[PDB]
Amino acid sequence: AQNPNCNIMIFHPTKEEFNDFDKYIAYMESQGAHRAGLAKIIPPKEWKARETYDNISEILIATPLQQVASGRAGVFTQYHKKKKAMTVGEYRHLANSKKYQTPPHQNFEDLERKYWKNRIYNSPIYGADISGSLFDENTKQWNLGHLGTIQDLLEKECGVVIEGVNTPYLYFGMWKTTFAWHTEDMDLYSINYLHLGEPKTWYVVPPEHGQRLERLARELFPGSSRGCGAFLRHKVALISPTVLKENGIPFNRITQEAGEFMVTFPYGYHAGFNHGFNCAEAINFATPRWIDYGKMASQCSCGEARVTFSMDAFVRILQPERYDLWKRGQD
């Protein structure tokens, strides 16, 4: 069995190997990369996502989200308070202000210590989940707006044609902006490209151990767990690495820098935080190996998770027993 300790693997494809996206994902899996839940892909040196980032300041962040924490420094929830619209130029200036800027630090480890000590005492503003792309249309390799769609994969594997579309999302971050512990919708893959700015630190639980994280989360968030049998689908709970180690939960960590891709694998729980002003692009995707995860994915039916249009068909086809309850939660 490849990668039996479920370490995060880092790949350096050549320009030739960068041509065929599906083939390369399958290669990484042949080497055991999915056992970690997360892999890093460093593009060949010949590649670029676009020519420059000099002209992005007029992008609008229609609904910036202030991420307000409740709890203790290592075990907390966050809720999102909606703020007034602002441009990417305005958001960048805000990120760099004295109130929000990254503190002085020695290295990534010192900054990680500072994040876990102090996150809860601040409420950073995240420009998350903005439909759009920063890949140039002429970028033919690993262009996250030109991937094969999940609807087409389901149709190729299962023979059923379904409605829905699959487009990327932009994320504009600042120091301490945070992504809570989650797997993807329908336990899909994700791919995330850090276009510019400061790093993103990731934490991940191997898919084979995801239920250990779920059991800890039910213990640590007991109100939330009574409310919903899949409350991590609400994407609000944070647990620090120290607390994970105290409770024997297997995990790994890595820091993504600008110009790098990360891939999350089906049922790989992940969480993390941004170091300072940055912009990432991410999208979900599927492969043949995903189908069995999609069929078994948990679902939130309490009302909280509320998701895209395109999840309907995935539930309806892959999980017909669950469909009626889940759809009630959508309505």
Ligand X SMILES: O=C(O)CNC(=O)C(=O)O
275 carries a ligand binding annotation: no
Determine contact, residues 268/6, Cβ cutoff 8 Å. no
CA gap 33, 270 in Å, rounded:
15
Contact 220, 329 (CB under 8 A): no
Asked if 217 is part of the footprint of Zn ion (rule: CB under 5 A), the reply reads no
- Does the annotation list 182 as a binding residue? yes
In 39-107, where does DSSP find H-type helix? 88-95
Nearer to Ni ion among residue 92 and residue 200 (C-beta): 200
Give the Cα separation of 9 and 33 in Å (integer): 6
34 annotated as ligand-binding: no
Which of 171, 181, 265, 277 contacts ligand X by CB under 6 A? 171
Which residue number, 94 or 264, has a Cβ lying nearer to Ni ion? 264
**Residue with CB nearest Ni ion?**
190
Residue 5 tokens read as: 């300790």
Whole-number Cα distances in Å, 206 to 32, 37, 270, 297: 11, 5, 9, 16
Pair 212, 250: CB distance under 8 Å: yes
Which residue is nearest to Zn ion, using beta carbons? Answer: 228
Q: Is 183 in the site for ligand X (CB under 6 A)?
A: no
Q: Applying CB under 6 A, does 267 fall inside the site for ligand X?
A: no
- 76 touches ligand X (CB under 6 A): no
Site for Zn ion contains 257 (CB under 5 A): no
DSSP 31: T
Task: For strands 38-41 and 9-11, give the pairing.
Answer: parallel
Separation CA 184–CA 189 (nearest Å): 7
Minimum CB–partner distance for residue 264 and Ni ion (Å): 6
From residue 55 to residue 74, what is the string marking binding to Mg ion with x (rule CB under 5 A)? Answer: -x-xx---------------
Question: With binding defined as CB under 6 A, does residue 175 bind ligand X?
Answer: no
- In the complex, least distance from residue 241 CB atom to Ni ion, rounded to whole angstroms: 18
Q: Is 300 in the site for Zn ion (CB under 5 A)?
A: yes
What is the rounded distance in angstroms from the CA atom of residue 86 to the CA atom of residue 108?
29
> Where along the sequence are the contacts to Mg ion (CB under 5 A)?
56, 58-59
> Where along the sequence are the contacts to Zn ion (CB under 5 A)?
228, 300, 302, 304
Q: Which positions make up the binding site for Zn(2+)?
A: 228, 234, 300, 302
Q: Which positions make up the binding site?
A: 126, 182, 184, 192, 200, 228, 234-235, 270, 300, 302
